Structures are given as C-alpha cells and as structure tokens.
C-alpha cells in the first residue's frame, strides 16, 4: 500500500487505523484484526490507557517490527520539556518495543509556553532514537507559527478531525505551506456521511462502499486517513481503496459539502 | 430525573439520548438494551444503519412502557420525495415494531432541492398522520432552512448536527434558535480526542467529574440535546449522571473559546 514522504525523509503508510474509546480487550482485537488484514500504521494514544493492549497484538503478529509503524501521543498530563520526554519512554514500556515511529503531542491548549516546551522534550526524543518522526494533533496556524519561529523545528504530521463536512482546506494549505503532512481522522462524520447523497452517488458509480469513497477522497487530498475501529469484515473493506480513484468532478462534489 | 426540552410543536424530548450508528444488528440491540435498563429514554436509530429491527428488539424486550421511551428515526437518502418518505416513514415502524415515533428526520439535504423540500411535505403528512409525534431534520444550513420554512410553512422542531467544543457550531445554533428549532448535538467527544483535552480535564478535576462528563454536561448547558455515541454499560451509565452539577460561567466561556 502506497506511503507518503515526511520531511524527515521517512515513509508512512496513507492510511491506518485508529484504537481510541477501545477497551484492552477490543484494543488489542482490533489490532490483530487489522494487521491480519494488511494495515501497518497503528494509531494509539496514552491518553486511551490501550497502550499494553495494542503491544500485546503487535507482538503475536508475527510481522517483523520495522514493517509496522506504530503512532502514538503524549498525554495532556505529561506535557512539559522535561515531563514529555520520560511519557514518550513510559509509553514505550508500555508497547514493549524499543521505538515508535511516530509521537504526536494531543492537544496544544491555550498556554503556550507548555506545547512549546512539549515540542522541544519531543525534538529531543527524535534526537535520542525514542521516535522516529514527531508531530502534533491539532495545531491551528498560530500554534504552528509559534513552534517553528521558537524552535526551528517543524512537525511531520498534523492530526486533525477531517471528513466532507469538516474538510480542513484552510488548515491544510497552511500544513501544505510548511511542508507538513494532514492526518485525517473520523473520515465517516459520526457514520453520517456513509448515508450522504452526493457519497452514495459516488460510491454507485464506481461500485464501492460509501465508507471507500470518503477514505479514497481523503487519500486523494494529500492525507495520510486513520479509521476508527472497524469489524474484520470492514477492515479489509476500507483497506481496499486502491482499486479506484475518483474523478475531478467526483473530488469537486465532495469538495463542495463544505 | 432526566430533564427534557420544549420543541416548537409542544411536543418534549429528553435532553440525553444514545445513538446507535455503525452498529450491527447484534451490537445495537446490546447497546439500546443496555442503556434502557441504565436510564436512557431518547434512543437515536436512522433507516440508513440498518439496525432499526434490532432497537425495536431491545424497547419491546425493556418491558418499559412505550409512553416513557422517546424513538428517533430518519429518512434514508434513497427513499427521499414527497409519496416515498410516507412509505418510508411506515416502513420503518414495521421494522420498529412501534405504532409510531418520537421524533421522525430527513437525514441530509443534499442538492437536489425539489427532493428535500417534498420529503419535508412528506414529513408532514407523516406528522398529520400520527406516525411521527414530530418532525426534524439533520445537517440542514441556514440556506436549507430558509427553503424548506418559506416553500413549506412548517418548520422543524429539530436540526440535528456535529456539534463538541472543537466545532460548536454557534452560527448554526444561533440559526435554530431564531426558528425555535432545537438543536440535537452529536459527536460531543470529537472522535474521543476532547477526553484528554487540556481545559476539559481541568474542569472535570474542579468538579470531580470525568471528561465525558463535562463535555456532555456543556452541550446540555448550551440548550442543545445531546446524543451520546454507544459505549460500555459502566461508560453509558455514567455519561448519564450529568445532573448533579453545573459548569460556571467562566468554565462555559472556557469551553466556548476552544473553537476559533
């Protein structure tokens, strides 16, 4: 499945998925439902208390580590320069495994002295082979302007709720113009946009599920798209989205909901 | 006690329910049982999920009295227009197993205009008829609203849309507050990220109550109703105990300022 290129020169898979509200028992299923199915980029959080979870199904998987790319967070607790860069170590632990491949801070909040700090604990976890790349989840344009004039360091990834009702244009010019990638996540609008019209139209014409054209409009964004769990037999559904692309027309329409 | 709101029609909701989207047949009826037997009364269903029989399944299996429980179903898409929303609407009921519903919505507007604008007539009738005590609408804009009252006369009693303190939608709200149409929110966690949110974790620690907890508690605050995404019974029964505190202006405000 096809990746894009973070400006630490390394790869992720363009989609994953995403672990969160999961108890350890669902967590760790759903992990081991999706690997089996092809997914390699995982998304958890500390914050969702699944870590050990997650870990436990990455282990039984049987797939050799550096073809799973493992994203998890800093907890708003833990955030601080110093405070971070122990979290990112205790999350470890947590995983079992001596590196992720992508820690994200959750939340800037409106103090900006602790996400500036967070940031620089995190450039010092890259830095120290604790995760391989480093970035945010929802950062607005001042946050991000902030971190780069303060740091000189620019994150990987932005994480931001994306679906057509929510399509984040604004933001991802903004991600584009630093040369961050956009990480969407709740693709399907609260399962809403599974029953839209101008979805369904879509996903007749080509044959697909709704969930399938609102992943590949995603894709074709430019966004690396994590799905919520799931069930095994819609798992390798939403995988499945690289069989088709949507037209310019096709893109317009979903590009208009907003 | 569980408060409720006034719609437009007189008719009342509660002002929490659960939602039963991306569910199976199996998982739904679990959820609504579960729920029911916690305290939830106003249960959100639409026809597009396809588990309309398995919450039908769970009220009746309740043995709580139908005049207590508070249905909310929606028009799929497909079955959209002014003959085929009454077809519809009783379509579901039949699959409910229910004489009528709470409350009945079109769940998009979409861009064929006529469409939605028949539906609405439809919807209507289907209030007219007794099938639906009331009648709403889902992600419908200013511009939809605008269409369905001036071509209509009838005016929703409900908008139902995304609503959590990363997108509060107080345009929207102030939209449906100048038709006296209430607003019934969704998603009130953001995809659970707002859990761990920094300023929702400090009013939870002020209040000794979890983030949930507040996060529900500010929705309800707005005037909104608040529909919760099914959960854990040990989950859905303390998103339900959101009655025995109040946010304070200033932590409102807080709230408030998250989406800028």
Same mark, same amino acid.
């Given at each position: 499945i096809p990746t894009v290129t973070l400006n630490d020169d390394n790869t992720l898979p363009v989609v994953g998925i995403g672990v969160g509200e999961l108890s350890d028992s669902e967590a760790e299923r759903s992990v081991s439902a999706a690997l089996e199915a092809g997914y390699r980029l995982i998304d958890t959080a500390?914050? &969702?208390? =699944?870590e050990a979870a997650v870990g436990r199904a990455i282990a039984a998987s @049987?797939?050799?580590?550096?073809?799973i790319y493992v994203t998890t967070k800093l907890a708003? /607790?833990?955030? @601080?320069f110093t405070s971070s860069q122990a979290a990112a170590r205790a999350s470890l632990e947590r995983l079992g495994?001596? &590196?992720?491949?992508l820690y994200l801070i959750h939340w800037p909040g409106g103090d900006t002295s602790k996400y500036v700090d967070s940031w620089g604990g995190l450039m010092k976890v890259k830095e120290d082979g604790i995760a391989r790349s480093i970035g945010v989840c929802n950062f607005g344009a001042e946050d991000l302007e902030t971190i780069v004039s303060l740091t000189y360091f620019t994150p990987a990834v932005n994480q931001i709720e994306l679906? /057509?009702?929510? =399509?984040q244009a604004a933001l991802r010019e903004v991600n584009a113009g630093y040369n961050i990638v956009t990480e969407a996540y709740g693709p399907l609008g609260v399962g809403r946009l599974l029953d839209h019209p101008a979805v369904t139209a879509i996903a007749e014409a080509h044959g697909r599920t709704a969930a399938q054209v609102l992943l590949r409009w995603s894709i074709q964004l430019g966004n690396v798209v994590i799905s919520r769990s799931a069930n095994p037999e819609r798992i390798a559904s939403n995988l499945d989205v690289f069989g088709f692309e949507l037209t310019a027309d096709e893109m317009e329409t979903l590009n208009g909901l907003d």
């Open positions: 500390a914050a &969702y208390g =699944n @049987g797939i050799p580590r550096d073809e708003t /607790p833990d955030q @601080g495994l001596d &590196y992720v491949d679906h /057509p009702l929510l =399509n």
